[PDB]
Amino acid sequence: PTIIYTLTDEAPLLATYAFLPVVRKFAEAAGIDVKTSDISVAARILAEFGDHLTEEQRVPDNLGELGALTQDPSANIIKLPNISASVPQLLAAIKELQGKGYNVPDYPANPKTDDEKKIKDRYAKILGSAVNPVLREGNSDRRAPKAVKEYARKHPHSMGEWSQASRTHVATMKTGDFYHGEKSMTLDRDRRVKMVLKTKSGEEIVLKPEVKLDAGDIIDSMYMSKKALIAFYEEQIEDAYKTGVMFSLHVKATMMKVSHPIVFGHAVKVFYKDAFAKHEKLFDELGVNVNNGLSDLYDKIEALPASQREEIIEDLHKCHEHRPELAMVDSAKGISNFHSPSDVIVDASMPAMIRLGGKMYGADGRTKDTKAVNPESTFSRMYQEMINFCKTHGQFDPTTMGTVPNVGLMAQKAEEYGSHDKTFEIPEDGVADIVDIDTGEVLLTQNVEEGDIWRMPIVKDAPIRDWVKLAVTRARLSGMPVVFWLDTERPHEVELRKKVKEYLKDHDTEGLKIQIMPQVWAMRYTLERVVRGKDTIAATGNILRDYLTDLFPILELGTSAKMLSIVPLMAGGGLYETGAGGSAPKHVHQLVEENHLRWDSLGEFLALGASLEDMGNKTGNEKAKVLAKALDTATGKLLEENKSPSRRTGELDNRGSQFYLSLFWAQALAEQTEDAELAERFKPLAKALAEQEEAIVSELNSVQGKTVDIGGYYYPDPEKTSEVMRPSKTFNTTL
Amino acid sequence: AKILGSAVNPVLREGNSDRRAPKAVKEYARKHPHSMGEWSQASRTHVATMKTGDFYHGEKSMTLDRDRRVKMVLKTKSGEEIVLKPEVKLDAGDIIDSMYMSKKALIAFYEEQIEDAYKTGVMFSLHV
Amino acid sequence: SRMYQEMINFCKTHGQFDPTTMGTVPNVGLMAQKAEEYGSHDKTFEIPEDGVADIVDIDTGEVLLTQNVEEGDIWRMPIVKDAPIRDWVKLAVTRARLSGMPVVFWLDTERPHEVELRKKVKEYLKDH
Amino acid sequence: PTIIYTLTDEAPLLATYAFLPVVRKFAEAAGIDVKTSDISVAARILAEFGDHLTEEQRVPDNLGELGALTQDPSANIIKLPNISASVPQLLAAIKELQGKGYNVPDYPANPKTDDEKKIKDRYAKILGSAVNPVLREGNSDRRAPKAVKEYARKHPHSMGEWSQASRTHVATMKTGDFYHGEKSMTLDRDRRVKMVLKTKSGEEIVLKPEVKLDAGDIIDSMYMSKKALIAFYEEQIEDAYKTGVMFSLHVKATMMKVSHPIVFGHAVKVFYKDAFAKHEKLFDELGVNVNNGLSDLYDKIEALPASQREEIIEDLHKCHEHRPELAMVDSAKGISNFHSPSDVIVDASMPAMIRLGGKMYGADGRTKDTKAVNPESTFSRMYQEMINFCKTHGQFDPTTMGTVPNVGLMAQKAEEYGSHDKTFEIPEDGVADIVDIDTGEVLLTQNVEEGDIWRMPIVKDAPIRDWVKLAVTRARLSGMPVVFWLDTERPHEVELRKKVKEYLKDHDTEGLKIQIMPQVWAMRYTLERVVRGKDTIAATGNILRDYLTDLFPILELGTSAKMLSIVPLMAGGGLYETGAGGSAPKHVHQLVEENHLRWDSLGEFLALGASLEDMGNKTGNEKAKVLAKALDTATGKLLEENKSPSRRTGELDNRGSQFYLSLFWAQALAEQTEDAELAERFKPLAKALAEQEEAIVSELNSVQGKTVDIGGYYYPDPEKTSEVMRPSKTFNTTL
Amino acid sequence: DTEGLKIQIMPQVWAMRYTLERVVRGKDTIAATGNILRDYLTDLFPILELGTSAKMLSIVPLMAGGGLYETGAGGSAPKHVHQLVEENHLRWDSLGEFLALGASLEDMGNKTGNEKAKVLAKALDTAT
Ligand SMILES: [Mn+2]
Ligand SMILES: [Mn+2]
Ligand SMILES: [Mn+2]
């Protein structure tokens, strides 16, 4: 019986070093082996480019290893947050590996040879959201545990007031976006299809040559219009200008790597319509692509003669005086919403804005109301309901409000999350058809234009069946009502409806409140009961899973770090994400400069409990059951005793919190009475740890306030990292 | 006092309201649209209303079993009983409500709303 | 008043209504025999001093509805009779059948008076 | 805002002495006054016979007082278990009261002078089940609270295995009993009726002069043929003998105080017919009434000369040679089934027998199979189905089985529970009619014989309406389907069916599974469901309410002493029974002799929670809600921490468990955040109690293991009892 | 979307009786029928109601999106010609052509957004 514990990047990794030894010590008491899997950015680079490496240097394909392991009914994988590499991050990681004797190739930005174009594609496999599409072979069960909600109640986080006179709102398209021209259908049998564009010339361009579809698959033909999108941006910028409200843009270019940078880019184009007109010729032969934000423009003009570059920056600030005020990522540095598409990520930025009382930062560094532009309507309308609701009701009260768990459809690159390699920026005007290869049958027709974003999302029948089952299970186990958020006026969501209606009958739903509502209705109904302190479960698609599991946890708890994220793997196993967020680069900074790690490991403690509980239910391990029960109360006690990491250096940090957890864990195991072997086994552990409490905490705190050597960043040296992360002689030995 | 105010309506209204626009009028409106003020997504106008201490949030109600004669009385702190309404004839199946608005809640609400309208710079209005 | 706010919100997000495309909203209103608030004028009082306000059956000593009120508070007892309610439900059905349009009874769940009405509507719909 | 807590008899009262102070302290924080009410056997003797008592000695008619309070829409009564006095109990209570200066008359068993008849008739008000009929002005909502059910799953109680080859069965009449001769009708209008017997002679005997009947009342005219009853017994006693299976008899002479002793008596008569023939003349003038069991015979022969009394007992033990084996109540002492009608009580004995695997105890001390004789078929056939089910399915599994909550028609002396003053042993062969005085119309005729038992049960229309409402209420609120146990072949239940069918339509039953099935079908349907882990509500008549709320809880939980018994009164208030069992005489035995009370007050804690919660809803007291939910979580923690009273002397007792409850109740209020004032109010208290925990516990346990002085039994001294029941001064001073 | 519509299916005999029962007392009913019944009925009732089928609309909304407009279901009337060649009087009623053209221009207007074609259709409707 074995649990895989992922070694990842930056902060969670550093924490793992201190925590792995303690989980291993507790897990062996139930005959559980804990093996690491290194899926760091460095490890993934070394696994891809083994060619130029020695035998000792080479790394196995650890990501792909886990990808296979998800097909095994006995899988038990605990996934920690890891880096989704941007280009700058990849570059830094390559230079660190090269510097350490690993001959890996330079990343070729603009490749001049055909062999450079070849390795740039191999690097593309490392860039961006690479891990998640592989590991997510089950659906999402994301929710906050009772002990965490009770902590929020006892220590209410700061929330900004919602004035009834608030001017902030969600501006979104009403025609010409993906939603309003969308086509959809469920497949009657297995088909192999192609995406073609029948041009005005009579020609037929092939955009995607072959894609294998199955029986019961739901496929969409959706497109956004370049013309409608520009017009929309024209209207909303002028409106923001006339009404005097700060302009902001909220998309997710990190994940939607094809469509969303185009959308982001157009916003910038029309906002600065005037400057991009005066410098059209210069910009094209400079190759500036502002889809990468203003960051791309500033970069390609930084090396220009002063007077020439200073004319361009003038034409940008001159364009501002008849434009609305812009939201700032960092006003002190002068970094705006338009700088980089990776700066303002929709799933995080929107809740941040709502929590702050519908506010974002301005040029002067003061919080302002905003027109949160959310071009695609499909998933943005639900935000507006909350805003409106908030205007009439005020800010949410974290002390009294209910919870909104989520049962998200995400398995096997579900819906939009798998459509990246099937999204195309239409080259010229024409008619876009998806066509069956083995028969001249046109399946979904659409009339598109030059610049349009066309795409074909896919959701498979098997994930859908599991998703309905997961929703029913959660209804049954928690007693909470579940609402499926499915529109009637969105073809894709009426297709899902047909399946949800059918597959609900294949279960025992006798005493369960289960209904289906359009998103805006569903959001309202949910808000209506949460404000009265009642709980509701949201059964949603992939993107809504993303949006809602940031929105509500941030409002309820103040963060999305302190929650359960369980993935019941379809083959029978289980994946346990410890965090939906990043790997916290700023956290590492504080540790390396003055050794205080302020990373909260509660998400790791929670996932482990879920992992141990499911291990017992699936393998018949009674000891694992007892370990899970003990850890839960230990986690609960850690919250109650307020022994989570402080942010201020010199005070209790991640390392100290891990001690208290292990103390309470050993304590719980000593005073439990369903397993006598374990009770007496941990009795001396609990006794030893409690009696040396103040010496251990002393050691773990007196070591702070100084620079520390971890031997790198993207590839830390284990020996030196282990020293830093386990500095208490007393704690190490007594363990 | 019997001539003052809305005197006519409560005497003639011995039925219920079937109020509706006639098709000819609705069809004329479609063909000849009246002017409508445009709504700004950034509009600051809102209904301000009480959250506690109004009729709604302290209301009690019942459906009556039988015909009875009730009075409305205030049992004062002193022990004295002031009769406010000597007699009212209730029928079986009558829905009656006991309903009150707190003076103190109303003044607090008003001080908060007037102040809020000022601090935000939005124009105050009262609709009764 | 909350109804108005919903429209305001709706209007902020959807814009102003278009008279050339919008549908009708006819009303079937309960009003017969000085129903609800429209008859409560003779039964509304500005409370002279702090005390308990009860509505009491004069024959026998049964206190039907009690309430704790303050000096300056406004307290009232609205009435709505059973046969008007019967007529109102029937009129709703008749208007539904004749026009062929859906009908929504605007009745709250968190308002005592409107739950009492709800009981009768649920009953008298079975009579048609 | 007043809660009425009932002072009763024996163990529950002793627990109250320690608990009343701590409930008062909590209830005052919400503005609720806890007012006492004394309904003990002693206080009921005093209230009746205030003839020779001083002003200070006199007590109000506390039962009549509470009976009157049920009409008050604000009634909040907590009913603890109380004595339903037998003759020996009555005498002992009288003798103690006399010796303490209370001048009350002796109870004359056989009144010599006619003045003794009046005071014997006045004592008849005190005898037996006198409290329940007065307090039950509502219908029964009996169910096991979720937290208790969960505890039974984690800690299963022992259950005897059911052999497929088991021979045990229910024996019951197929003709000549109440069921197979029943006539019933629903009243058209108000009537006044008399019960008359027109004899064969021509005389008219008035058994009941007048009874006032309302419109919509159901009345029955049921009788049991004496000739049939004896022939049945002859047959069954013979069958049990021939087949070699143990004979047992299960009736309820305790509450069915008129009919069932006649039923019990006849069994003894035909069983020992050979001895009752040899001594018929002697038995006659001794006034032997074996309707009171063999104990009656043994009493009346104990005074006789040795050679004669020994001859009698020899003719009784000699009769066993041609007879079947008898089930024993105490096989060491030789106390059998026939000793006393109050030993084997159908509602408790039948579950106990099923729980054991279909076993009762033998003369040899061994457990064996039994012919469980239940003469009246009406409510016994339902037991047989379970026996059959178990025979094919095995014994129930407490770790996986569902629940069977009950909604019981009992309000206003419903059905058989209010037919005692209307039951008659027929003096001679005739026709038994219930006749209207105004217009000499015979409503129901019936041809009866000498010995036959005749009765007219009554169930009023208004109770039936509330009963149906409570069924739909429970269905809506719990999501469980509900089944009405109504026979198609029983007049009474077809009359009820007419009503249920109609009154259901008066309610919103849109999302509910609600159906009507005959008893045996309903039982089978319910069993088919529990065994698959599914829940079902039983909406039943009065006697079935009693049977099923012992039966299922014994199987699910091991006891009927750990559950909610809510009585929503028809006038608006609520009565909350804390227990359905006795007042535990033996528990007092252990308290006075060795200072350990093993009474489980869980039923009190649960009832109080349901008392405080309903206080919040009815009045609008939000502070009541907070106390209720905090007691709910306090009671739940009591179970999970395993701190219910031990039975062993020297360990944690009733007093000790009351400390832990009040501790957790205090903690739950301190660490909650839905009421700011209450939180900081209990904060120092909760901090106090927890701090000297193993000091208070140390006191409450050290004082055990010795004889103690409470100053009486039926009327214990309030000053002495309070010293004993609150022996921890550390604990007491803390409030 | 059939929510406010009365739609039902009956056998031919029943449907005919049902239809007759309503039309004998001024009520209108649409007959949704198969091919031969379409023929039979659009002669029968138009003859009974109007005397001829040469005074009605026969619109064929073409499946591909267009529209065919039959001006008459009857023949080309040879005897009308005999009168025109011998006496110079054409008694042919072109009312079926006026109505068809009116339906043609109206569909033209709604299909292609032509407002001037809509105005031609309405002016023809009133002229007819
Ligand atoms: Mn997210
Ligand atoms: Mn019982
Ligand atoms: Mn024809």
DSSP string of A553-609, one letter each residue: HHHHHS-SSSSEEEEEBTTS-EEEES-SS---HHHHHHHHHSS------HHHHHHHH
From chain C, pick out residues whose CB is under 8 angstroms from the CB of A169: 12-13
Residue D616, amino acid: G
Q: Which residues pair with B18 in a beta bridge?
A: C28
Residues D282, D305: Cα–Cα separation, whole Å:
13
Q: Which residues pair with A516 in a beta bridge?
A: A484
Q: Following DSSP, what letter does each residue of C59-83 receive, concatenated? A: SS--EEE--EE-TT-EEE--EE-HH
- Hey, are the CB atoms on A384 and C13 less than 8 Å from each other? yes
Hey, how many other C-beta atoms are within 10 angstroms of the C-beta on C31?
18
Structure tokens at A625: 């059951």
The length of chain D is 735
Residues D705, D703: Cα–Cα separation, whole Å:
7
SS3 A685: helix
Identify whether the C-beta of residue A627 lies closer than 8 Å to the C-beta of residue A679. no
Residues D214, D461: Cα–Cα separation, whole Å:
8
List own/partner pairs for E51-58 with CB under 8 A and 24 or more apart. E52/E93, E54/E93, E54/E95, E54/E96, E55/E93, E55/E95, E55/E96, E56/E96, E56/E99, E57/E99, E57/E100, E57/E103, E58/E96, E58/E100
Structure tokens at C106: 């605007």
Q: At what angle do helices D346-355 and D381-393 cross, to 10 degrees?
A: 10
Residues A509, A498: Cα–Cα separation, whole Å:
17
Q: What is the DSSP letter of C51?
A: E
Q: What is the dihedral sign for C-alpha A183, A184, A189, A190?
A: positive
The residue behind tokens 């860039």 is A127
Question: C61 exposed, middle or buried (CB, 10 Å; 0-12, 13-18, 19+)?
Answer: exposed
Residues D543, D545: Cα–Cα separation, whole Å:
5
Identify whether the C-beta of residue D458 lies closer than 8 Å to the C-beta of residue D418. yes
Q: What is the DSSP letter of A448?
A: E
- Hey, are the CB atoms on A371 and B41 less than 8 Å from each other? yes
Residues A24, A16: Cα–Cα separation, whole Å:
11
Label the pairing between strands A140-143 and A564-568: antiparallel
CA nearest to D234, candidates D203, D206, D271: D271
**Which residues 103-122 of chain C have a CB within 8 Å of chain D?**
122
Q: At what angle do helices A622-640 and A602-619 cross, to 10 degrees?
A: 160
From chain A, pick out residues whose CB is under 8 angstroms from the CB of C13: 169, 384, 388
SS3 A459: strand
In angstroms, the Cα distances linking D149 to A267, A480, D603, D612, D644 are 60, 19, 14, 22, 15
Chains near E, with 3+ CB pairs < 8 A?
C
Residue A611, amino acid: S
CA nearest to D474, candidates D555, D566, D608: D566
Residues D534, D524: Cα–Cα separation, whole Å:
13
Structure tokens at D596: 């350990």
Structure tokens at C41: 């004028």
Query: How was this one solved?
Result: X-ray
Q: What is the DSSP letter of A447?
A: E
Q: What is the DSSP letter of C48?
A: -
Residues whose CB is less than 8 angstroms from the CB of residue A80 and which lie 6 or more positions away in sequence, other chains included: A6, A7, A8, A12, A13, A16, A578, A579, A583, A604
Q: What is the DSSP letter of D363?
A: T
Strand stretches in D430-502, DSSP E: 430-436, 442-444, 447-448, 453-455, 458-459, 482-485
The residue behind tokens 């307090």 is D135
Residues whose CB is less than 8 angstroms from the CB of residue D125 and which lie 6 or more positions away in sequence, other chains included: D48
Using CA atoms of A685, A687, A693, A694 in order, give the dihedral in degrees to the nearest 10. -140
Structure tokens at C20: 């050339």
Within A325-460, where are the H helices? 346-355, 381-393
SS3 annotation, chain B: CCCCCCCCHHHHCCCCEEECCCHHHHHHHHHCCCCCCCCCCCCCCCCCCCCCCCCHHHCEEEECCCCEEEEEEEEECCCCEEEEEEEEEECCCCEEEEEEECHHHHHHHHHHHHHHHHHHCCCCCCCC
CA nearest to C63, candidates B71, D614, D571, D620: B71
Residues whose CB is less than 8 angstroms from the CB of residue A257 and which lie 6 or more positions away in sequence, other chains included: A128, A129, A420
* E strand or H helix at D522: helix D519-530
- Please give the annotated binding residues of D for D-threo-isocitrate, written as ranges: 129, 132, 136, 142, 252, 417, 545-546
Residues A121, A125: Cα–Cα separation, whole Å:
7
Judged by its nearest atom, the ligand closest to the C-alpha of residue A252 is 1
SS3 D535: coil
Residues A531, A523: Cα–Cα separation, whole Å:
12
Degrees (nearest 5) of the Cα angle D417, D402, A616? 155
List own/partner pairs for C89-97 with CB under 8 A and 24 or more apart. C89/C120, C89/C121, C89/C124, C89/C125, C89/C127, C89/C128, C90/C124, C90/C128, C91/B16, C91/B18, C91/C28, C92/C28, C93/C125, C93/C128, C95/B18, C95/C26, C95/C28
The length of chain C is 128
The residue behind tokens 């929650």 is A563
Q: At what angle do helices D542-557 and D146-154 cross, to 10 degrees?
A: 40
Q: What is the DSSP letter of A81?
A: P
Residues D590, D598: Cα–Cα separation, whole Å:
8
Residues whose CB is less than 8 angstroms from the CB of residue A484 and which lie 6 or more positions away in sequence, other chains included: A471, A497, A500, A514, A515, A516, A517, A522, A539, A540
Q: Where in chain A are the domains?
A: 1-137+571-735, 138-570
Q: Which residues pair with D686 in a beta bridge?
A: none
Identify whether the C-beta of residue D420 lies closer than 8 Å to the C-beta of residue D256. yes
Judged by its nearest atom, the ligand closest to the C-alpha of residue D351 is 2
The alpha carbon of D464 is separated from its chain's Cα centroid by a whole number of angstroms, namely: 21
Residues D295, D329: Cα–Cα separation, whole Å:
13
Q: Following DSSP, what letter does each residue of A218-232 receive, concatenated? A: EEEEEEE-HHHHHHH
Structure tokens at D615: 């206080």
Max distance between CA atoms of chain C, in angstroms, equals: 62
Residues D463, D420: Cα–Cα separation, whole Å:
19
- Give the count of alpha carbons within 13 A of A67, CB side only: 13
Residues B58, B51: Cα–Cα separation, whole Å:
11
CA nearest to A374, candidates A544, A169, A520, A226: A169
Burial profile D615-649: b = 16 or more Cβ within 10 angstroms, e = fewer: bbebbebebbbbbbbbbbbbbbbbbeeebbbeeeb
Minimum Cα–Cα distance from C100: chain E residue: E4
SS3 A206: strand
SS3 A104: coil
Rg (CA), chain A: 27
Residues E9, E15: Cα–Cα separation, whole Å:
8
Residues D646, D657: Cα–Cα separation, whole Å:
9
CA nearest to D535, candidates D402, D386, D407, D397: D402
The length of chain A is 735
Interface test with C, best of B4, B57, B97, B125 (most C CBs within 10 A): B97
In angstroms, the Cα distances linking A391 to A357, B20, D431 are 9, 33, 80
Q: Following DSSP, what letter does each residue of D286-345 receive, concatenated? A: HT--GGG-HHHHHHHHHSS-HHHHHHHHHHHHSGGGGS--B-EEETTTTEETTS-TTTSB
Identify whether the C-beta of residue D555 lies closer than 8 Å to the C-beta of residue D351. yes
Using CA atoms of A607, A610, A613, A616 in order, give the dihedral in degrees to the nearest 10. -70
Residues A699, A704: Cα–Cα separation, whole Å:
9
Using CA atoms of D154, D160, D161, D164 in order, give the dihedral in degrees to the nearest 10. -140
Residues whose CB is less than 8 angstroms from the CB of residue A290 and which lie 6 or more positions away in sequence, other chains included: A265, A268, A269, A276, A296, A297
- Please give the annotated binding residues of B for NADP(+), written as ranges: 9
Taking the centre of ligand 3 as the mean of its atom positions, its distance from the CA of residue E87, in whole angstroms, is 30
CA nearest to A615, candidates A75, A59, A63: A75
Residues A385, D468: Cα–Cα separation, whole Å:
41
In angstroms, the Cα distances linking D126 to B66, C56, D108, D535 are 38, 38, 14, 40
CA nearest to D28, candidates D2, D66, D57, D53: D2
Q: What is the dihedral sign for C-alpha D518, D524, D530, D533?
A: negative
Label the pairing between strands C68-69 and C51-57: antiparallel
Residues D433, D426: Cα–Cα separation, whole Å:
12
Residues D1, A130: Cα–Cα separation, whole Å:
64
Residues D622, D613: Cα–Cα separation, whole Å:
9
Residues D718, D17: Cα–Cα separation, whole Å:
8
Residues A27, A23: Cα–Cα separation, whole Å:
6
**Which residues 53-112 of chain C have a CB within 8 Å of chain B?**
53-59, 64-67, 69-85, 87-88, 91, 95, 111-112
Residues C89, B16: Cα–Cα separation, whole Å:
10
Residue C81, amino acid: K
Residues D256, D548: Cα–Cα separation, whole Å:
17
Residue A184, amino acid: S
Structure tokens at D263: 């039923």
Structure tokens at A669: 């195991």
Q: At what angle do helices D622-640 and D146-154 cross, to 10 degrees?
A: 10
Degrees (nearest 5) of the Cα angle D391, D392, D397? 85
Max distance between CA atoms of chain D, in angstroms, equals: 84
Residues A467, A460: Cα–Cα separation, whole Å:
11
Residues whose CB is less than 8 angstroms from the CB of residue A420 and which lie 6 or more positions away in sequence, other chains included: A256, A257, A258
Residues D580, A412: Cα–Cα separation, whole Å:
57
* Backbone φ/ψ region at A415: left (φ over 0), alpha (ψ -120 to 50), beta: left
The residue behind tokens 């739940």 is D636
Residues whose CB is less than 8 angstroms from the CB of residue A517 and which lie 6 or more positions away in sequence, other chains included: A483, A484, A485, A486, A525
Interface test with B, best of C41, C63, C116, C118 (most B CBs within 10 A): C116
Within chain E, where are the H helices? 12-23, 35-50, 78-86, 95-112, 115-127
CA nearest to A403, candidates A478, A500, A295: A478
- Please give the annotated binding residues of D for substrate, written as ranges: 129-136
CA nearest to D604, candidates D3, D44, D149: D3
Residues A619, A32: Cα–Cα separation, whole Å:
11
In angstroms, the Cα distances linking A298 to A257, A339, A340, A359, B87 are 21, 9, 11, 28, 84
Residues whose CB is less than 8 angstroms from the CB of residue A483 and which lie 6 or more positions away in sequence, other chains included: A514, A515, A516, A517, A522, A525, A526, A536, A537, A538, A539
Q: Which residues pair with B76 in a beta bridge?
A: C51
Using CA atoms of A699, A702, A703, A707 in order, give the dihedral in degrees to the nearest 10. 170
Max distance between CA atoms of chain A, in angstroms, equals: 84
The alpha carbon of C41 is separated from its chain's Cα centroid by a whole number of angstroms, namely: 16
Q: What is the dihedral sign for C-alpha D651, D653, D657, D659?
A: negative
Q: Which residues pair with E13 in a beta bridge?
A: none
Distance from CA of A248 to the nearest CA of C (A): 17
In angstroms, the Cα distances linking A445 to A422, A458, D277, E111 are 16, 17, 103, 21
